[PDB]
Structures are given as structure tokens and as C-alpha cells.
């Protein structure tokens, strides 16, 4: 009916007027490109050849446009159409049209998209305004859009099959509007939380943490190679930190050349001892924690997500608030390039040896689990003998569940702390967690020590069968193993009942995600 | 032992599962009976006398690993991965390219992908034998380094060796089949397969009609570029209308088979199959058997890839940052077990709940073949030749080429066709 045509999503009002399919748009898969700048995007040649930008023929660009017209649609840097003053679109694709190749002022050559064009880049859903940003085109071989890795966080994009839409402005007026209101360097700091939206991420973050340790010493050739990738370099090699016995620069000393202008910042590393600030060695910091950037020079400190990440007061945020958005763009790009090449030197990996812990660590984890299981058994015996008394506001069942959960959670935390004590400096799980690049201490603990309690609907694994969880357990078993506690680590390997309970927990998480999407989308539409 | 010995001689002993059921050794139990039955996961661990948990077991599981399905049974060491990662691997294993059936030549199915050189996994679950994964495998074993090399493996992407790709690594064939039926609707209006003529047929296109044979159908073995005319069909106009089929844009294939038959109605019916050989590009999607996928970030030649002392360069480099948050340790255990199996010559056993295959035992086995216990290896930088300071985890892991390829997804629009009702750009 006529109402159905106009009513809902896919109706005229919402599906055709509020939003609509548009021309000059291209969608393809995205792959990383550390070499591109923040604002630069990588466009395949075919996408650039289909999309066109109409350029008015002026006396100063008539020669270049006539050359482009001569090349035509076949040769890539060419023109697809010529729009006359009358509005007649001479077609350069179909037949030479030798008389109609002529250009005069006022004609519009629909040239192909070239390097330097401003294009809007979008990922769905566009939750915030940083999800649509203006990028400068660079044409590269192969068929994927290529974007810098610092720009992944605003788009919420990972290169695992994601695709991105690209919209090309068709007028100089709208091109200037996009360039000024929406350029990526201008979108660094969000108004939502007055923090930078973008920060150093993934390999660059871990390599920065390793690079800014006290231990890192770089010889002359490595220093020159890294300075090769610094675009803002003044061409002057800093005097090395250690002149004799052999000239050796430091990772901090080279990173000091990255920091632009004269930026002043004080942060603290993630593994900063709380005792150091109160006690002596406040400004010496035996662990080389803390971070002090004075006059744009990294005097001391190890950088992590707290210094180079998306947080208020970060070196990135201070750079944006002090030096500007263009210089901050250069800052991001230089960090990525020189730290990625140093990472080529030092390298990074994850292996089985990271998951393995000391024999003593495993023994302590086992002893903690034994003690916890014994304490849960004691609590169950108190409950059975009716010694247990209800906690105020809770039933006897609820207070028993709370006590058992507290015991199991404390044991899990103790095993996790033992596993984390086991970790060496060289451990790479610990490297990624400390840098903040990926992972958490919870993940390390589950990998090495104990997967933990599997809980569904906020309670331990329910009695799905008649008064028992699985047919293998006896009826009325409230012990840790029966109700879902997994004492084995991922490396050790879950036992079959633990495997099923873990599957139950993961299923609950997946269901939560899937159900969440639609409710949040409806709320967002209502608010807007 | 009598039953197991007779079943071991199964053929030429006429003893089968039904005889096992008839003997009363095994029994079928449904969920309602599962509610009233005391089960033991394993006979030895549970039935045998110990500190008595239960002394009234009524049944025993044949093997725990049977709780998984078909797609989850290919996952090696699934008990060492996070649970959502096994779901992801089930979904992605439904999308891996392999030899789907042996009669794939006879079948004319639209959108068929078949891999050049499928390999059976070096680390395999026993239940795979009953899924026929050895007979029709989907994926290739590949030397994989878990390293941060040039930043092109960051996020979830994967660096690939271009030399390996050039030697046949993950090369596939994509067959697209087109069906056209000549039919008569009006008594004077009929559709005929013929080569359209510029003057005789009113509707025509720029597209070359020369490749069409006399019957109006392209012969097999002819290269057909995008928008060329596969089938030439003309309709009498009560001069003629061109309803000829064209290639899907950017198909760029070679005709494989052209069959001409009569359908149920008795009208002539034609099926034409087109081969497009797809080599891995830097947009194509590859996934391990552990629920972590990624597009190919870049391709480096064998001179550029990092190399070990022995001269081995990884076929695939995956970012280490994938492992920690996802906690897919089964991937690392599979690399270690694959290294051990490839040096030993056996095929590794990755059944979910073996309890006889620890990581420490695999490490000790790898030590005997001259490698580091944990599988790390001193890698030399391909570009400069200097040793990489951090020793890098290398091993043979089984990887699957998912059907999602960048060439199928790349699209662009500029003043193209427009819908009739909305007069807005079209969809798709």
C-alpha cells in the first residue's frame, strides 16, 4: 500500500530521502600500510580509474588537462568525459572524437582520481564523527585500500576482512569543506572525551617500549638508517650519549628527535612502583619508569599506552594542543616509521616458551588450587551441617554461593599473581601487556596458571541436568569442579567437563555481543 | 578384549558395530536417560578404585572428543584455545577452499572454488579420519613465523612469501557456470541461440560478438574478458531483440566446458563454465585452524623474507599481537607439534583430550632433532642480513584459504545505471 511505501526503513522517507545510494563511491577490503601517512590512503588503480573529478578548464591548467584528454580513459592518468559549456558530455571512452578533443576555458574535464585528491573514508557503523574522515589519495598497486595503523582505532577497523567505503567530493567547494572540517589530522582529538582518538598501536607500541629502555644502544650505522626515515630531521646527527669507548646513541636520544618543537610532558609508566614517588630516587627511578619530556627531549622514561596512547595528557595530546595538527600528523608518521625499522632490527615474537612457567611456579599454582578446593569442601560441609548462617540481605543459598565464589576467585587471583611473578623480562606476553599494545594480565594468568570460574548469567554453571551439571558428576555436588571451575590453564589444556563449561561461558559472551548490537543501535538512532 | 580383537579384524570377520550393540556392550542413551545415568569420561581414570567419588557408574564415554561436531573436529588441540575461537574456526572451516568433491569436473555448479595443491594436516585429530579430511583436504601446511617483520602483518593481516605463492602456494581455480534456456512464449515470439548480427538484431552492444560460434555459444578454451558475450540469444520481435548473456564484470576467465541439452520442457538449454585461476593477492583472506584469520598485508620475495640458518624462509608471517588477547595457544602447540612431525616423519596427534601429549613432551621431542625446545629459531633479517635480536617462533602450521577474495569485493561507481522508481543509483 501507499503507507507501506513510505512507512519504515526501506521506505521513501528513511530509505530514499534521509539516506540514499550515491555515485562516486568505492568499497574494498583494507590492508595495513605503515609507510603511508595518517591522512594518506592507498587507492587501487582500477577504483581510481572509474571514479572521476570534474575540473574546470582554466587558462593556467588548459595544457595539463588537454594532455589528460589526449590520454583518454584507457591510459590511466586520463579523462573519462569532457563537459562542454552547453552541458553536452563528450565521451572520451567511446571513439577518438578528434574534433571534440579541444578544450576551452569553461569546459569541465572529468579527470581520473589522482594522487593528492581528498576523499571521505567511512566504516560501518559510523558511531562517531571520526568514522568518516578526509584522506589524501595515494595510488598504489593491487586492489585494497591501504591506511596507516594509527587510523585504525577511530574507524574500529582491523585488517581481517574488513572493508571501507570511499566517497569522492565532486566540487571544489565541497572539497575544501571536507579538507578543513574533516581532515584526519584535524580529527586527532575527540570532543567526546577531550582525548586524542588516535595513538601509537600494535607493533609500534611494543617496539617503542623496547626502544625507550635504558639498555637500548644504537651504533652509528643503525642511527643513520633510522634517521633516514625521520621526515622532520634537521640533517644534524646528535652527539652520541656514549662517546667512548665506542660511539653509541640511545633509543631515547633518537626518539628525542621525533618529538616536535619544544613539548613538556610528565607521565608514568605502567610498571611504576608506587613507593618510588614517596621515597628516595623520585627523579632517578631505578626502573627507568616515569616519563619526562623537557624542551621536546626525552630526558628519562619508558613510553607505553600511557605516554603515546589515546589518553588525556599524553605526548600525542600535548603535541596536538601545543604544536598543532599538521605537526602532530608528522609526529605520528615519524614514530611509526623509525620505530618499525628499529623493530626490524630487534624483532618481536610470541611462542610456547612464553606460556611456560617455572616448575616452582606450577607447583605453587597447584598448591593454591588444592588449598582452595579444600576450603570450598569445608564450606560445603559447614552448610550441610547447618553451621552456616545467612549473610544479611542474602539467603543461605546466596551466602553459600558468595562464600564459594570468594574462595575460588581469591585462589584464581593468587595463581595469576604467581604466574605473573614467574614472567621474565624477555617474556613477550609480558612485553605486550606492559606496552599496552595487546593483552591483559588476566590473559597472561589464564594462559599460564588457571582459566578460572566459568559463570553463566552471573552464577556458576547451572544444574542443567536434574540436580547436577553434567551426567558425570554426582547429584548435589557444589564443589569447584562440578560447578564450572577450570583449574587447568590454556597451555595445560582443559579437561572435557571444563571444556564444555568453557564453551558455555564463551557462548554467553557471544550471545551478549549479538544481542547488544541492535538495542544500542536503536538507542543511538533515538538520541540523534 | 574379545570384542576389540574381533572388531580389529572387522573385515573378513563379519563383526561390526551392530554386533557390538547386540552383545550388550554399548547402548544408545538419549537426554532423558542421560539424566538418570552415572557416566565416566574414561574407564581407567574413573572406574578404577581410588578415593571413591562414585562407585555406581552405569556407563562410560567411548571418547570425550566425540562431543564436538564435524567442523570443530578438525580443530587441533581445541582444549587449548579460547571457546569463541573454536566457534570462529568452525565458521571459517565451512569457508575454506579445497577439492569439494572428486566429480567436480562433471558438475557445472555456479561459484565453485577448488585448490591446486591441498595437503593433509601434519597435526591432525583422529576423528578427522571419519570426516574424510585426508581424502578431500582444504588448506596447505605452511612454514609460519610469528613475528613483527615490516608492519604489514599488524592488526590481523598476514605477510606472505611471493616466491612460495609463485611456486603454487594457495593457488585456486574459480569456476562460474552460466545457464541460458531458449524458450517460446508467444506463438510468433521465440528465443533462438545465434550469433547476433548488427543489422539483423536491433539490440546490440559494443561487446565483441565474434567469439560466439555458429550456434551462438562460445567454444571451450577461448579466453573471455569481462563483458564479453558468452551466449548469443536473440528474440523475434513482433527486427530482433538481443537477450545475449554477458560475463560478470571483471570475471576474466577461460571457457572450460559448454554443454547443450534439452530441459524438461523440451527447449534447448545451455550451460557454460568459465575458469578463472586466482593466485593469492594482498587482499585475500587466510585463516588458521584456530579461529584467527587475516588478509595478506604484503608479499615479499624469498630474498626479502627472514631466513633461518638452514635457509628456511617462512611461507606466512603472522603478527604476534594476535596471540595474547585471543589466547589461541592451540596454534602455538600446533606449530611445535608440526615441527616435530615434519622432522620425525610421523603425523602429529592433536585429539582434544589425549592426556598423553603434553607440551613438555613435544618440546623434548623437538630437542632431539636439533632445534630449540620451544620452537624459537635465530632468524636473519632478509634485507640487511643481520641476526634478528629476538629469536622468532617458526613452524609448520595448517592454513586455509577462505573464499573471501579482494577481487570479488572491489567496486566503484561513477554515474552508472539508475533505478526506475527512485531514480537513484542501483544496488549491488
Amino acid at each position: 500500500s501507499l503507507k507501506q511505501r513510505l512507512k519504515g526503513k526501506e521506505g521513501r522517507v528513511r530509505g530514499n530521502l534521509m539516506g540514499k545510494r550515491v555515485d562516486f563511491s568505492a568499497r574494498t577490503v583494507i590492508t595495513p600500510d605503515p609507510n603511508l601517512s595518517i591522512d594518506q590512503v592507498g587507492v587501487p588503480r582500477s577504483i581510481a580509474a572509474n571514479m572521476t573529478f570534474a575540473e574546470i578548464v582554466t587558462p593556467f591548467n588548459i595544457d595539463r588537462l588537454q594532455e589528460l584528454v589526449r590520454r583518454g580513459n584507457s591510459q590511466y592518468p586520463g579523462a573519462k568525459y569532457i563537459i562542454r559549456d552547453n552541458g553536452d558530455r563528450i565521451d572520451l571512452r567511446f571513439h577518438p572524437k578528434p574534433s571534440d578533443l579541444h578544450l576551452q576555458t569553461g569546459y569541465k574535464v572529468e579527470r581520473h582520481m589522482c594522487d593528492g585528491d581528498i576523499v571521505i573514508f567511512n566504516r560501518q557503523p559510523t558511531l562517531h564523527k571520526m568514522s568518516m574522515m578526509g584522506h589524501r589519495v595515494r595510488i598504489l598497486p593491487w586492489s585494497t585500500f591501504r591506511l596507516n595503523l594509527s587510523v585504525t582505532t577511530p574507524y574500529n577497523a582491523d585488517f581481517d576482512g574488513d572493508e571501507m567505503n570511499l566517497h569522492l567530493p565532486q566540487s571544489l567547494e565541497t572539497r575544501a569543506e571536507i579538507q578543513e572540517l574533516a581532515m584526519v589530522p584535524r580529527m586527532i582529538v575527540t570532543p567526546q572525551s577531550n582525548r586524542p582518538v588516535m595513538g601509537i598501536v600494535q607493533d609500534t607500541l611494543t617496539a617503542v617500549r623496547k626502544f625507550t629502555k635504558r639498555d637500548v644502544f644504537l651504533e652509528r650505522g643503525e642511527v643513520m638508517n633510522l634517521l633516514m626515515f625521520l621526515s622532520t630531521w634537521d640533517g644534524k646527527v646528535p652527539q652520541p650519549a656514549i662517546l667512548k669507548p665506542r660511539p653509541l646513541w640511545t633509543g631515547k636520544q633518537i626518539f628525542s628527535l621525533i618529538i616536535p618543537g619544544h613539548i613538556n610532558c610528565i607521565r608514568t609508566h605502567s610498571t611504576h612502583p608506587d613507593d618510588e614517588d614517596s621515597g628516595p630516587y623520585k627523579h632517578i627511578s631505578p626502573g627507568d619508569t616515569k616519563v619526562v619530556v623537557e624542551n621536546g627531549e626525552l630526558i628519562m622514561g619508558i613510553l607505553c599506552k600511557k605516554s603515546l596512547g589515546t589518553s588525556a595528557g599524553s605526548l600525542v595530546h600535548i603535541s596536538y594542543l601545543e604544536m598543532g595538527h599538521d605537526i602532530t600528523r608528522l609526529f605520528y608518521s615519524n614514530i611509526q616509521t623509525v620505530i618499525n625499522n628499529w623493530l626490524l632490527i630487534e624483532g618481536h615474537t610470541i611462542g610456547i616458551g612464553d606460556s611456560i612457567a617455572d616448575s616452582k611456579t606450577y607447583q605453587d599454582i597447584q598448591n593454591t588450587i588444592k588449598k582452595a578446593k579444600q576450603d570450598v569442601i569445608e564450606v560445603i560441609e559447614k552448610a550441610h551441617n547447618n553451621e552456616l548462617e545467612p549473610t544479611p540481605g542474602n539467603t543461605l543459598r546466596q551466602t553459600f554461593e558468595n562464600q564459594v565464589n570468594r574462595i575460588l576467585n581469591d585462589a584464581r587471583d593468587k595463581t595469576g599473581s604467581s604466574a605473573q611473578k614467574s614472567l621474565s623480562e624477555y617474556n613477550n606476553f609480558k612485553s605486550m601487556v606492559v606496552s599496552g599494545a595487546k593483552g591483559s594480565k588476566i590473559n597472561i594468568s589464564q594462559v599460564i596458571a588457571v582459566v578460572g570460574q566459568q559463570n553463566v548469567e552471573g552464577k556458576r554453571i547451572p544444574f542443567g541436568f536434574k540436580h547436577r551439571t553434567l551426567p558425570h558428576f554426582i547429584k548435589d555436588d557444589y564443589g569447584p569442579e562440578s560447578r564450572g571451575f577450570v583449574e587447568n590453564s590454556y597451555l595445560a589444556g582443559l579437561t572435557p567437563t571444563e571444556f564444555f563449561f568453557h564453551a558455555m561461558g564463551g557462548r554467553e559472551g557471544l550471545i551478549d555481543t549479538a544481542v547488544k548490537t541492535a538495542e544500542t543501535g536503536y538507542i543511538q538512532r533515538r538520541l540523534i | 578384549k574379545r570384542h576389540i580383537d574381533q572388531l580389529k579384524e572387522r573385515e573378513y570377520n563379519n563383526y561390526s558395530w551392530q554386533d557390538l550393540v547386540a552383545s550388550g556392550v554399548v547402548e544408545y542413551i538419549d537426554t532423558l536417560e542421560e539424566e538418570t545415568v552415572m557416566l565416566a569420561m574414561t574407564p581407567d581414570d574413573l572406574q578404577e578404585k581410588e578415593v571413591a567419588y562414585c562407585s555406581t557408574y552405569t556407563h562410560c564415554e567411548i571418547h570425550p572428543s566425540m562431543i564436538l561436531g564435524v567442523c570443530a573436529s578438525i580443530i587441533p588441540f581445541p582444549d587449548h584455545n579460547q571457546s569463541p575461537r573454536n566457534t570462529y574456526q568452525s565458521a571459517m572451516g565451512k569457508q575454506a577452499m579445497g577439492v569439494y568433491i572428486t566429480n567436480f569436473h562433471v558438475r557445472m555448479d555456479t561459484l565453485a572454488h577448488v585448490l591446486y595443491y591441498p595437503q593433509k594436516p601434519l597435526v591432525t585429530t583422529r576423528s578427522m579420519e571419519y570426516l574424510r579430511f585426508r581424502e578431500l583436504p582444504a588448506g596447505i601446511n605452511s612454514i609460519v613465523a610469528i613475528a613483527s617483520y615490516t608492519g604489514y602483518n599488524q592488526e590481523d593481516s598476514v605477510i606472505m612469501n611471493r616466491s612460495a605463492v609463485d611456486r603454487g602456494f594457495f593457488r585456486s581455480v574459480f569456476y562460474r557456470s552460466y545457464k541460458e534456456q531458449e524458450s517460446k512464449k508467444g506463438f510468433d515470439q521465440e528465443e533462438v541461440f545465434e550469433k547476433p548480427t548488427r543489422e539483423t538484431c536491433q539490440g546490440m552492444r559494443h561487446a565483441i560478438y565474434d567469439k560466439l560460434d555458429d550456434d551462438g555459444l562460445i567454444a571451450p578454451g577461448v579466453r573471455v574478458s569481462g563483458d564479453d558475450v558468452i551466449i548469443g540469444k536473440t528474440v523475434t520481435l513482433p527486427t530482433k531483440r538481443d537477450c545475449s548473456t554477458f560475463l560478470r564484470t571483471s570475471e576474466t576467465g577461460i571457457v572450460d566446458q559448454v554443454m547443450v541439452t534439452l530441459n524438461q520442457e523440451g527447449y534447448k538449454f545451455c550451460k557454460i563454465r568459465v575458469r578463472s585461476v586466482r593466485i593469492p593477492q594482498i587482499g585475500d583472506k587466510f585463516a588458521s585452524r584456530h579461529g584467527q584469520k587475516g588478509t595478506c598485508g604484503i608479499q615479499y620475495r624469498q630474498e626479502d623474507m627472514p631466513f633461518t640458518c638452514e635457509g628456511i624462509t617462512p611461507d606466512i608471517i603472522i603478527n604476534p599481537h594476535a596471540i595474547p588477547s585471543r589466547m589461541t595457544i592451540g596454534h602455538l602447540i600446533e606449530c611445535l607439534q608440526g615441527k616435530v612431525s615434519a622432522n620425525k616423519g610421523e603425523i602429529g596427534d592433536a585429539t582434544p583430550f589425549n592426556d598423553a601429549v603434553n607440551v613438555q613432551k613435544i618440546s623434548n621431542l623437538l630437542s632431539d632433532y636439533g632445534y630449540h625446545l620451544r620452537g624459537n629459531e635465530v632468524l636473519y633479517n632478509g634485507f640487511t642480513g643481520r641476526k634478528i635480536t629476538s629469536q622468532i617462533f617458526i613452524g609448520p602450521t595448517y592454513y586455509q584459504r577462505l573464499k573471501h577474495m579482494v577481487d570479488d569485493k572491489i567496486h566503484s561507481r561513477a554515474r552508472g545505471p539508475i533505478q526506475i522508481l527512485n531514480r537513484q543509483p542501483m544496488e549491488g
Binding site: 565464589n405 575460588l408 576467585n409 584464581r412 588476566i442 589464564q446 582459566v451 578460572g452 570460574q453 566459568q454 559463570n455 553463566v456 552471573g458 552464577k459 556458576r460 568453557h502 561461558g505 564463551g506 554467553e508 559472551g509 551478549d512 | 579460547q82 571457546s83
Partner: peptide
Amino acid sequence: IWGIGCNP
């Protein structure tokens, strides 16, 4: 999958 206070 961790605990009651964590995640499932």
C-alpha cells in the same frame, strides 16, 4: 569465562 566479577 574468568569469574563472577570479570567476564563470562
